[PDB]
Amino acid sequence: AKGVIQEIIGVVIRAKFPEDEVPEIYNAIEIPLGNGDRLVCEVQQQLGNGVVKAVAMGSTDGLRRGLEVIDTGRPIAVPVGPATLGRVFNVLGDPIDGMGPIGPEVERRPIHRDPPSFEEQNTQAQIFETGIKVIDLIAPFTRGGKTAIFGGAGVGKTVVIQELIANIAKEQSGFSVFAGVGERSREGNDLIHEMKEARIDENTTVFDKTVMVFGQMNEPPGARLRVGLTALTMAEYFRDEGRDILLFIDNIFRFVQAGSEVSSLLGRMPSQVGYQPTLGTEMGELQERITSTKRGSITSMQAVYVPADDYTDPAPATVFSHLDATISLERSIAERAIFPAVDPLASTSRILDPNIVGEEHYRVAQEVKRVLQRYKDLKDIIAILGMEELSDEDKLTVQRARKIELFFSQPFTVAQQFTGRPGKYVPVKKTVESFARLLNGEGDHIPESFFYMQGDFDDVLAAYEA
Amino acid sequence: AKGVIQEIIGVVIRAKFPEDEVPEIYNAIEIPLGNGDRLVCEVQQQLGNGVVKAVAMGSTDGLRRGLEVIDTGRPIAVPVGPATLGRVFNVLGDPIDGMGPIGPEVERRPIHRDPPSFEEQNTQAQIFETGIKVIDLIAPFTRGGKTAIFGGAGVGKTVVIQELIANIAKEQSGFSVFAGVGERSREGNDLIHEMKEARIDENTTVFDKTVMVFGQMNEPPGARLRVGLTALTMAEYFRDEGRDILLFIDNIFRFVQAGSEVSSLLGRMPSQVGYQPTLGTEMGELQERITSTKRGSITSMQAVYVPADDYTDPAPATVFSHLDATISLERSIAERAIFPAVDPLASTSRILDPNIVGEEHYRVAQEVKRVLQRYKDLKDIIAILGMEELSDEDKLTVQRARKIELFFSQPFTVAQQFTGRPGKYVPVKKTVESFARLLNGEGDHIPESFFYMQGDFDDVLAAYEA
Amino acid sequence: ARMVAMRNATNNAKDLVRDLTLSFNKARQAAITKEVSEIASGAA
Amino acid sequence: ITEELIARLKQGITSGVDLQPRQVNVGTVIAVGDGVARLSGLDQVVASEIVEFPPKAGRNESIYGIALNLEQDSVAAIILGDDETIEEGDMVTSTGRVISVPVGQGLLGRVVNPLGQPIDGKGPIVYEKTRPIERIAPGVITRKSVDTPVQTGIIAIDALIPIGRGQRELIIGDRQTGKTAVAIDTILNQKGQGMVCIYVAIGQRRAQVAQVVGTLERFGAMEYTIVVSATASESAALQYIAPYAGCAMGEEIMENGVMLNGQLVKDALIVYDDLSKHAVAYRQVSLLLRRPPGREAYPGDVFYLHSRLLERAARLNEEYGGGSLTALPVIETQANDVSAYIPTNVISITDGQIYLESDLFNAGQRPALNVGISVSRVGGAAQTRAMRAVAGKLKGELAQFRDLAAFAQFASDLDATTKAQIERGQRLQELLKQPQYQPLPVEDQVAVLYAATNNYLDDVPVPLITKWRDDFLAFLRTAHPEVRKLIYDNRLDRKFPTPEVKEALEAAIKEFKATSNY
Ligand SMILES: Nc1ncnc2c1ncn2[C@@H]1O[C@H](COP(=O)(O)OP(=O)(O)OP(=O)(O)O)[C@@H](O)[C@H]1O
Ligand SMILES: [Mg+2]
After folding, report:
1. Which residue out of B147, B319, B326, B353 has the highest number of ligand 1 atoms within 8 Å of its CB and is therefore the one to mutate?
2. Which residues contact B180 (CB under 8 A, 6 or more apart)?
């Protein structure tokens, strides 16, 4: 080890090393900053005789060529274990919260792991029961499978995230990891800190049950590129213990953009619309460690920002190639106070097939979407001439569709203190039975109210009687 | 101070000078030819060991790889003074007109000069009095400001230029400069020279009050690049005397294009769509010398040609970043015998706010262009309704719009010997008062064609009384 | 009849807008690809 | 007591200087390009030092440069001054400091370079502290949720797109639309709100910056405003470092504060007048340094470029001082190409957008905000309780009108409720129209919006609505000065329309409407 800086061009630096002991690729070389603090650079290329090209992941403004460089001999070492729970880290594993250092006794693992082998993968797909009626019915989760959420963040996305964390914490092993890739320091860090510390469940705050890794906006492209890998490294410790983990990645498109910026800085030839040539490979290094293995499962929900409005753009296309379910939060559904503002028609899922979720689940879900689709077609006509022109049965479908879309609302345990309403966890079988019994004709006499922010059909009736 | 040519690639010449006598970054190289004249280059990049890369300014179809080059020490020196008035010059300041060379006694000034400092800039925008009603009302100029005409041929743009020169030379001292940058030699020359020599005012031809510098499309990119700076130096000489200068940079866009080529041949790394990386700075170094200081003001009215019809293109966008007013000459207005083809709409100016021009000027300028805000949209209705025979009140608005459209026309002094009609100089106060009183309804008694070519409303009245 | 005809025309116009949006996005991606390709070629 | 001067001297003279000669490392310029020098072997140079280029024959001054590229056997130094004087073979000395700018009370009402050198010609800068350009953002746990509102003074922004202290609202628009006008209106409205505005003017013309400074001085806003300026003619290095100098000057206000009107002001507002021109300057710098380009020829670290700059704008908590730094970046799009590279980068970075459209600007809606697409993710937290309580119905009715915006010219042949909604939307849109350099205080906006949301302007015709406002406030300014103070005093009350202020405002509106005719 003990190299010397040979070149500093922006974040991309080059370090010369002896002919032997040259660092490997992704080896996290360290530059002392003249004090206790240090600058960790990740080696991305090996050039000629000992020269290695690396990405700064830091300010790299106080550096001078000829400065000492130390090879760590391993990728970025991220602390893992129960000590990470309730703490907030950056890409390098340093805790950025008020609390002190993690400590040398805690195990540190390389950031660049390998996805589970072919043997360890589950042969069959198991449905992940989140407990939210609309999520578990229209676009059911997949255990160990990726999931995308589409929203403008003003539609209660954080509420859904907190509800998922609380549900897994209280009804499963329940550990979660939140990767703030490209996360704003104000909107995405302190606001979420206050929301997660204030939100409580069974005398334990949500923040105590989650590990938060923030690759912020102000960090160089390498940090935003590797923050997701840091989050996977942290979650893999809990996955290896047999627990089930939820990984929430905010704006995976920002991870794609960070990769593109790193590739542009390294000099690699551009591909398609300003995208890295290693787009598929980089998306495969990520989102492949998110699998349901024999020991445990990591299920991930990933916010996806669509450039312009292209679902054919290479970044959302590569994201979609690895997705099992899409949830489309929509503004109008949230303007009316339906907080679980999941658009049933737009939101889909791969696991919603008879051979996995059951024939009854598939049949009711299709009928729910069918009547809603008919309602969407008649949204024009109702504004055209009034509800009067609509034929009977079609008038029922409009009446029933409004009731069912109001019934998609569900009280949340994390929102209990704000709204003064206890949360209701509706199992998938209970959801299927309730919606089938709503469709078949029961509850038709009940008005649109009494379905708002309720649990199962049993709750809708008991309320009607009282 | 003598070097040897090393390489010749097109219009880019590399020349090796002695170690201690390397020319500066903008000096002239002045390659001597066998037949008596010289090829003046312009340094662009000091590099290597005494080697300078320069732009040819000429053909370079007769040069070997050993010819001597005589550094001139100073940048391209251009003749400035009253002597360089009423004469046509090239980029190098050599008079290309029939008359003899400029005498050695005339002061030569460097082509590259520092724009005026921030302290000398006027703290309040001031309107520039042209005398044209439509120009001084719809799109007022700025003292030391930039204006662009968007018009082709046959719309009287040349006559507008001639009248602007004549008006500034009569009301003020008003010497004028015309830099044809990348113009057709047919349009720019022998159709501007002859028209301005024929056009006369106070027994003095317009050409006698105007300096001309012409870098045409046939000349190498460096000539078209530095012709604008030549004209700026010639105008800045008079500006130093305190006299007001009107400068017409015809096809400022062809300036930008020239720079692009100069960069492509210089090995500079391309920016955006092939354009030079130094686009904003190059445009600033030319558009910042056009400003109103305490001593004098160089008012500029440029011409911009947008490739295809793309205002998104980097060259038009960079031009517009430095523009204060736009005048949109139109074919439809020109073919209607309206001699000033300035469109009342699509002709904007940032001076048109009540803080600078005045509340009354803004009020009337909003009263007009409001009856035409619809562009008499009634004209579409008249086409399929015949006015519904007549409009309840719209028919009045149509009458007022037609009257004011006719009134925008004005007899020009430069055309006084062509159409046999005396030229009318209309102050801005007269224009605002005339249009306001016409909009009140005083102009509802005279028929149309009485506003056809008259300077003021009072002049229209005199005609009605007689 | 005019109401029905305008409803059909609005639906057709919306479908044409969707098709033109797809075409415009394809053209936009192609333009970005061409620009970056020529910029990389000029750099190299 | 001159003896104190003699004692302080004659002691540092005798034993305060080493005077020991030593070898110092310099560099030789070996190639001067389009503002780029190579400096050959200048070792011990920091990655962003400011090299000196000491004076030589024919040059009595020094042009400084930034050593951006620390290559092997070469240091590509971007030149801050004019490159026409630096020639091959010139000696350079590596000043050991990264670029720092003077900060504090001294830089108020003064126009300065990005290097802190005054350009207004009113004397040397008086200062005692220099803050480093390019410092790390305040941090995650160092901030607090944005709660205090920044009163823009424009009804549209202050009512529908709230800006709070610490919030980063983006002013994005197309060419001449009013972005600088909105920024200047915001700056002029902070006369008594205890805020120190900063204007950066990246790449603007000298004439435009001069007119902006003249407007600020004419309204008396150049006693709390710091104007930085890196104009178009100046080198790309100055335009590249202008916003960072501005935000360092603002971070001094945020952390230490300055005495404004005899009060410790720790809130600052900074307006980056063109990040679309700062990005162009950085692109020129990168391409002249032959760094690998990316999309639209911008370098790879151009998102990082604006991200560093904007992520230093924060609302610090009480532990770290309680200061603030509001950022108002300005972007000039081309033909409303929001999907362009720099606009998308800054939109993703910022916490909100104020979309200014040329269509509305030309139509007559002079504040050309497009409320449909303009967002403020802070939202109601950046509004006083009065404005939050009153603007909800405004936003709802404006949205309803926008849904029916295609129907304005067919309002007669429509439903009574649809015609009423269209008419109310037209009245509200005419209300949001505002002249230049006439910011309305919070109480005036609250009064006007309370009169509008409640059915009080229904009888007033649309073309006179603006006039109505311009009269009504004048009435409240002269006839009923107490109701304005009553509104302003309990603007923070949770239930703002408390009966006292409700009756006072109702009576004022009725009295104004009874006397006036429209
Ligand atoms: N709110 C307003 N009220 C009245 N006039 C306005 C307003 N906003 C803009 N204008 C008018 O539009 C002109 C251009 O506005 P402004 O200079 O603010 O635009 P901009 O978007 O900053 O343009 P640029 O790209 O040229 O810097 C002003 O000089 C003024 O005449
Ligand atoms: Mg502006």
Report:
1. B353
2. B188, B189, B192, B212, B213, B214, B215, B216, B227, B250, B251
